[PDB]
Every structure is written in C-alpha cells, then in structure tokens.
C-alpha cells in the first residue's frame, strides 16, 4: 500500500530494562502511541503488546516484541502473517550504535548491519521493511558494547535522544500517508544542535 | 530422597550476557558439567540446554534455562514435573546480591529473597528447593542493581567468585550422595585464602 501500517518497537521487557540504550525503539512506540491516544496491551498470541488505531486518518498497529531482543521475529513474523501486513509497510524502530546520540535515519532495505533484533527479523520477512534507526552512540571498543547498550545514557545524550526522537515522531504523518521519500527526507536532516 | 538428582543454573542465554553478574548459576554448572564430562545439550522441549551423567557415583541431570532470568520456571517446572523430580531433590545455582564477592552458602527453603529467577520458578514448585547462593556483592542503591547484576565484575572480584564456586564445586559429592547438612556446613564456612 505504500502506506505504513504497522510500526514495531525493538527492546527488551521489564522496568530492568526500559531506561537502556538498546530499548530505543520501545521510546518511540511507547511515545508515538501517547501522542495518538493508541492503548497498547498484552498480546500473548504474538508475544508481544499491541494496539491499533487512528493515526492522522489511518487504521495503524503498533508492536513491541516481548521476546527479548534477540528473538523478536517470535512476534514480528507470526503478527505480520497473520495480518497480512506486507514488508513495505511496515517500520520497525530500533538503536543504533553507528550513529551518535541525537542522529536519527529512516532506512529503506539493507540487512541487520549487526543489529540482533533485526538479524532476528530479516531472514522470515525479507529485508523491505523501513527502520527507523535512532542513534545511541558506540563505546570504545566491541567488549563494551554489551555495558553500552544494556547500560542507562548519562542525562546528556538522553537528552539527545529524546529531542531526535521528537522530531521522527513529528513526522510520521508522511510515513502513515504513503509520503515515504519525504519522511525520509525531514526526518534525516535533523541536527541535534 | 535428600539425594540432589537435579542441578540447575540461572542466567541469560547469548555470548553478549556470559561473562554477566547475573550468570553466576550458569558459570557454577558449566564448570561442574565439564569437571564430571556431562554434555550440555539443546534441548527446546523444556526451553533449556540440558545433560545427564553420573557425578560421584550418582545420576545426575543438569539443567540451564534459555528463558531469560525472569521466565526460568517456563524451563524448570515442565523439565522437574516430566522427570519426575521431586523439589527436595533440586539444587539451583545463582547469583545473590545479598552476599559478597568471594561469599557461597547453601540455603534450604525459604522465598525468592528478591531474585527474579526463583521468583518465576518458587510458585510452581514451592520454596522447598536448595539454593546455592553465590556472592556477587550489592552496589549502593537499588537503581545501580541493574547495572550491576547485567554488568562484567573487575578482575578481583571475579576471582574471588571463581574461588568460592571452586569451593562448591569440590562439595558437590556430598549434595548428590545426600548429605546436604555436612555440605551446607562446608560450603558455607568457605573464606577466601
Ligand atoms: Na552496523
Ligand atoms: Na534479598
């Protein structure tokens, strides 16, 4: 449909973790579902929370996998089959560590780059699903980036974060329209400062 | 049967939480299954990677949830109620924040004390279970905890965890022959040298 139609979350469950890096995507479903006024509930046939609703004029679901990160297909999949959701309409929001804190990207295609929720994903949807790729900063060396991404961000870049992640949800008009070169767009040219 | 016929140790699966606090339970198995030769094997019937093998004269399972901490009862109580184990007879491994680096005790009975494992396993089995508590230390407030328990200890500590499970893993053969009273006295004695 062009049109997006359903937006996943990527994170991990429980208060433990919904402060760290790697719940980013959870931020902006969690948020973009205030905003709209979407209730998302326990879904234990797709292991996960959901929520449908209006917004801007279209029907939209929203997903956070209660999986784990690394097995979030366990929802992903079986929920976008069930729906008949095609990969084209779907955005999936997610961490990322290549990216600085206060960098946002909307992404069409590629594989996981890394990424253990995607790398979950890609193999049984294909890789033509949108991202929403929220920058989370890299720490020093590999054997950090467990610490890194496990870890709650120093106020700062949080700050950052937060402030990117404001602006994509401001533009999800375009995505849920159909307009996805233009949300691409807007979204990409926003500068932290 | 005060005889230990069932070993299980709490952790997270995956590389990225191995070297974790919270994976002391899996550290105390691991090394106990390849002091005796157990094969450690998947086994996704029962969630968990799981072996069988005489320890010391005895038959002895071993069992490692891949649930995630706080979902280990989804791999604990189907694999005790299919073998027919009876909670007297299951020793579970873990970390506690209540005791220090270098710290081991055995505790028979009691509640979860806060652990997020034993909490989804203590409902469906009860509390009449052995516990083997292994220190990892308590940082200052409850909101560096998890930072904490999913974080890498510094060198120093971890030797004087990898020397306390040392300690526990040398009085397994009284917890399997059934003497758990003469066990919990030597194991909880253990002081670092
Ligand atoms: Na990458
Ligand atoms: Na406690």
Do not use: C
């Not at 937006?7 to 579902?33: C, D, K, M």
């Not at 095609?86 to 961490?95: G, R, V």
């Not at 992640?165 to 999800?172: E, G, Q, Y």
């Amino acid at each position: 449909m062009s049109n997006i139609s359903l937006i996943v979350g990527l994170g991990n469950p429980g208060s433990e973790y919904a402060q760290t890096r790697h719940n980013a995507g959870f931020w902006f479903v969690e948020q973009l579902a205030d905003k709209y006024g979407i209730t998302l509930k326990n879904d234990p046939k797709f292991h996960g929370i959901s929520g449908r609703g209006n917004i801007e004029g279209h029907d939209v679901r929203l997903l956070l996998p209660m999986t784990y990160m690394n097995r979030s297909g366990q929802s992903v999949v079986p929920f976008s089959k069930f729906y008949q959701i095609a990969p084209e309409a779907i955005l999936i929001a997610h961490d990322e560590l290549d990216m600085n804190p206060g960098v946002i990207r909307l992404k069409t295609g590629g594989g996981h780059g890394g990424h253990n929720g995607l790398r979950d994903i890609v193999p049984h949807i294909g890789p033509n699903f949108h991202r929403l790729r929220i920058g989370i900063g890299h720490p020093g060396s590999k054997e950090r980036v467990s610490g890194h991404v496990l870890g709650k961000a120093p106020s700062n870049e949080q700050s950052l974060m937060d402030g990117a992640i404001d602006h994509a949800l401001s533009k999800v008009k375009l995505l849920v329209q159909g307009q996805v070169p233009q949300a691409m767009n807007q979204i990409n040219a926003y500068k932290p400062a």
